[PDB]
Design a protein around this ligand. Structure first.
Ligand SMILES: C[C@H]1O[C@@H](OP(=O)(O)OP(=O)(O)OC[C@@H]2O[C@@H](n3cnc4c(=O)[nH]c(N)nc43)[C@@H](O)[C@H]2O)[C@@H](O)[C@@H](O)[C@H]1O
Ligand SMILES: C[C@H]1O[C@@H](OP(=O)(O)OP(=O)(O)OC[C@@H]2O[C@@H](n3cnc4c(=O)[nH]c(N)nc43)[C@@H](O)[C@H]2O)[C@@H](O)[C@@H](O)[C@H]1O
Lengths: 343, 343
């Protein structure tokens, strides 16, 4: 159920504005190779957005300045914050701090931030609309920016099956929107799942349709199931793929993170680790399409777990908690990473 | 200049008003194993649109009904029309007529329709906006509909340089929006063009950003070149790819059709055929790309050719030619496809 999954991130975005518009400044360095179309990504994905409210920012494509937010992986003796999207371990001998998906900890030295807070953020960059279903909090961080109308034309069916101007069981079985081959679990599972009911591909891999899809979310809304396999297996490797399936009034058939039920509710989606073998991963669904009174619940289930009434994110993923990492970052200036003293 | 390419196609779609609101009916057959999101294409590719003004249509996913025009790419002793998009030769033994890409004559049994007639179709239909750069002639087939208002928010970098609000020296070298691997042509010349100066990808194959962009008209305008190669080679096989670089005020670096010059102007895109090899290709581009006076007149250039002043389609491809292509169909009763009799 996406409506709480959006209303929840909004409360995790609950912060206080600043005293004056003398916002404490900041200097940022990145990997050498990133570009304006990837630096607009740097300013558009969720991280710069939270530095956009507390601190003041000016970016640097020159290592000819000494700075505080040094990202990337292209420098030796500086103040360097990690930040990934791919499955990459953290190495605190070259860097200082880390933003990963490891269900880890290193005191004030690691900040697990899965890239499912970027599509969650980013899913709120489209709902600031007059022709949108999912609701923001009034005069919140996202409602403070001017509204638009690019939503009724893009999504006419995703705008439908959610608001109950249409049915969810009068749609199709499974859809496949993977485009990368190096993922043997992601690919193969199209085999088995298909020999029981057709599966629709939309990438370069197992492409069933006939056309390559431009809007990935209008796609799944015409389906009753989405397949959310990551490219590689990783405890915490839960990305935006699950989100683009929750957002689409469909069911994610998830596999990749052997520790996923912490992140989101194991009852609202199909978790493929929750099985002893693979043919049970196919059994779970064949009970749900057929006996609809059981397809409702999972479909009508909250992505998030609950707390004596209240619904939450795992490990208190919030706008604030991230700051109790960066504030401590700015703060202690111990050069943990090996002081580069070549012989 | 996309305006003339926007002026040409539109008046090819000029037909008088309906002299009688009793549009001649017509029942049509299709294939079987597609669905909702796939059969809507038989209404949405370049036939039903033209006819939903002229003939009255009722498609059939039900084989127990009567039809004259049998399309698809999947009954066998009736009147059948061959219609392809892929690479697959004429087949006069299975279907009766042909509606394809080759340069063949079989009297009324061949009509060469390259695929770009369906992107000129849509590229006139995705620009039916109030906030678009390409202004349509008033009160034509598209201007009859209600103008939208979602182009300048989705395409700000496309609307601009056509409204003349940008520098063309200030866009990246080459873009590459292709996601098929088995095409060394579109996988080596890339590296050949790329292992020189960066080429930017926008799919799964030879990617650059680390994401597949859903907006394919805005990506090419943040660059100077598009790599309008084909997967393989074919006479008369012109696709839709060539249009979308023509559409986006960028340059196609083209390969695929050794007769595209018959379709379009060869002094307006970069043609790898008109060279002895690939290594001759880079010399001419380090001119246009770097000798602006060649990137303009080629950007000021009509995609189509001209005929002592005015432009044309190859083989006079128009509505009537296709309209009066089907009249003959409803004319000759002669069974042509291989009469299947078993003894
Ligand atoms: C089978 C392959 O699976 C892959 O990994 P994984 O199974 O985790 O899937 P993922 O790579 O994590 O999927 C990323 C996709 O990115 C999002 N997105 C945003 N805009 C667009 C858009 O405009 N077009 C498309 N197509 N996608 C968009 C979502 O759509 C999401 O679905 C390969 O990396 C390989 O592992 C390979 O096996
Ligand atoms: C390198 C690979 O080349 C391919 O062939 P070819 O080099 O002819 O390119 P083509 O396959 O003919 O390109 C089709 C693309 O379809 C259009 N389109 C419409 N909406 C979208 C959209 O939303 N996302 C994307 N990505 N594309 C969209 C254009 O974007 C166009 O560019 C493979 O078939 C292989 O040959 C392989 O080698």
């Amino acid at each position: 159920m996406f409506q709480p999954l959006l209303d929840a991130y909004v409360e995790s975005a609950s912060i206080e504005k600043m005293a004056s518009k003398s916002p404490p400044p900041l200097k940022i360095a990145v990997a050498n190779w990133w570009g304006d179309e990837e630096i607009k990504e740097f300013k558009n994905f969720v991280l710069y957005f939270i530095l956009s409210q507390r601190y003041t920012i000016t970016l640097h494509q020159n290592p000819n300045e000494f700075s505080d937010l040094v990202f990337g992986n292209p420098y030796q003796n500086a103040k360097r914050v990690f930040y990934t999207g791919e499955n990459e371990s953290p190495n605190f001998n070259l860097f200082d701090y880390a933003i990963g998906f490891d269900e880890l900890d290193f005191n004030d030295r690691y900040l697990r931030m899965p890239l499912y807070y970027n599509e969650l953020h980013i899913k709120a960059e489209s709902v600031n609309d007059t022709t949108a279903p999912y609701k923001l909090k009034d005069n919140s961080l996202y409602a403070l920016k001017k509204p638009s109308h690019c939503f009724k034309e893009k999504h006419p069916n995703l705008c439908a099956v959610v608001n109950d101007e249409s049915d969810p069981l009068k749609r199709g079985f499974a859809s496949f929107v993977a485009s990368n081959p190096n993922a043997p679990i992601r690919n193969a599972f199209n085999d088995a799942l298909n020999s029981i009911e057709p599966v629709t591909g939309g990438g370069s891999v197992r492409n069933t349709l006939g056309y390559n899809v431009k809007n990935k979310n209008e796609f799944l809304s015409q389906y009753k199931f989405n397949l959310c396999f990551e490219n590689t297996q990783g405890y915490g490797y839960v990305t935006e793929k699950i989100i683009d399936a929750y957002f689409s009034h469909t069911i994610p058939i998830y596999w990749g993170s052997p520790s996923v039920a912490k992140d989101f509710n194991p009852k609202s989606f199909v978790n493929v680790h929750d099985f002893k073998n693979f043919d049970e991963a196919i059994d779970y669904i064949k009970y749900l399409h057929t006996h609809k009174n059981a397809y409702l619940d999972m479909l009508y289930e909250n992505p998030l777990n609950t707390l004596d009434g209240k619904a939450y994110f795992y490990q208190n993923l919030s706008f604030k908690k991230i700051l109790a990492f960066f504030k401590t970052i700015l703060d202690n200036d111990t050069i943990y990473h090996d002081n580069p003293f070549i012989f």
